[PDB]
Amino acid sequence: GQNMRVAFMPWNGYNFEDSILVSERVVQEDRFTTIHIQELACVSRDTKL
Amino acid sequence: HDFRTLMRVTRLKEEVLKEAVNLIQSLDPRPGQSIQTSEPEYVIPDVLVR
């Protein structure tokens, strides 16, 4: 995780029930950016032809 | 593949016809084939060697 600088206050209803308001600096500094890796495979599967 | 007679029939350019022939070549013959191309595996062995 990361040490975010939080503030506890309502803000125009954008954190109404369980929603969060995040500054653009968080996106700019590439916090919470994540790398994902997938696997794709193919087989030859020889035939009678 | 009688290119010489093709030349003397068409009155067409010498070795400048090659790119036109290549254009004809790159024209996807048999176009309906590419709608589905799945082919299965049908193999049954009677004798095994390892």
Nearest to A49 by CA among B39, B46, B1: B39
Alpha helices, DSSP H, located in B1-50: 3-10, 18-25
The technique is cryo-EM
DSSP secondary structure string for all residues of A8-38: -S--TTTTSSS-----HHHHHTTTT------
Question: CA–CA separation, A34 vs A29, rounded Å?
Answer: 13
* CA distance to A10, A11, A29, B25, B37, per residue, from B31 (Å): 62, 60, 51, 13, 12
Nearest to A5 by CA among A33, A34, A38, A29: A29
Question: CA–CA separation, A7 vs A21, rounded Å?
Answer: 10
Q: Per the CB < 8 Å rule, is A45 touching B39?
A: no
Question: CA–CA separation, A26 vs A4, rounded Å?
Answer: 9
By the 8 A CB rule, do B17 and B7 touch? yes
Search chain A and give the residue with CA nearest B45.
A48
Chain B hits for A48, CB-CB cut-off 8 Å, are 42-43
Task: Tell me the structure's resolution in angstroms, rounded to a single decimal.
Answer: 3.5
A42 touches chain B (CB under 8 A): no
Mutate to test the interface with B, among A42, A43, A44, A47 (most CBs of B within 10 A): A47
